[PDB]
Structure 1
């Protein structure tokens, strides 16, 4: 039977710098490196002396 089964089984230079700066601007600079959206508005809503700057 094993014999039968066995029978059945047998049967160049300046392109690199450009690509580097492209990759740098693509995945190095815009990676959430700042937090000012609250301090900006806090100093913008102060009427130091009318209408506030943010109101304008």
Structure 2
């Protein structure tokens, strides 16, 4: 009961240990949960043939970056 009551509150922990614990907790809780949607735009940009007629290929049409 003494260990639970007075041991392992993070205000008693040294600064660096609590900083490391905060780093791990911040990672899991915030950075992993942070969600942004880019796949449609990325695939559209990759699928776009970039200035193929302006570019002098004088041959078969070049495969797009997605291809």
Report if TM-score (shorter chain) is over 0.5. yes
Gap regions ≥5 residues in structure 1:
1-11
Gap regions ≥5 residues in structure 2:
1-13, 53-61
TM-align CA RMSD: 1.0
Partners of 1:54 and 1:13 in 2: how far apart?
49
Cross-structure match for 1:6: none
Matched, 1:20 2:32: no
CA displacement at 1:33 relative to structure 2:
2.0
Structure whose alpha-carbon radius of gyration is higher: 1
TM-score normalised by structure 2 residue count: 0.60
Relative contact order, CA 8 A, sep 6+: which one is greater? 2
- Which structure carries more helix by proportion? 1
Partners of 2:34 and 2:23 in 1: how far apart?
18
